[PDB]
Amino acid sequence: EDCGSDCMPCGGECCCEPNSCIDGTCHHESSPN
């Protein structure tokens, strides 16, 4: 079973890229340039 387009189950949620599903939460993703 899957959640979404490159997404993962985060405590009844769905973290999709570029974000990441870690620590049971949605770890946002920055772009330092």
From Swiss-Prot:
It is found in: Secreted. Disulfide bonds join 3-14, 7-16, 10-21, 15-26. It comes from the Eukaryota. Expressed by the venom duct. Belongs to the conotoxin G2 superfamily. 1 family. This peptide promotes cell proliferation (EC(50)=17.85 uM) and inhibits apoptosis (EC(50)=2.2 uM). The cysteine framework is XXVII (C-C-C-CCC-C-C). Displays a mini-granulin fold, a structure composed of two short, stacked beta-hairpins connected by two parallel disulfide bonds. This newly described fold is derived from the same cysteine connectivity as knottins (ICK fold). The name 'mini-granulin fold' comes from the structural homology with the N-terminal region of the human granulin. Negative results: does not show activities on voltage-gated sodium (Nav) and calcium (Cav) channels as well as on nicotinic acetylcholine receptors (nAChRs) (at concentrations up to 100 uM). This is Conotoxin phi-MiXXVIIA. It comes from Conus miles (Soldier cone). The chain holds residues 36 to 68 of 68 of the full protein.
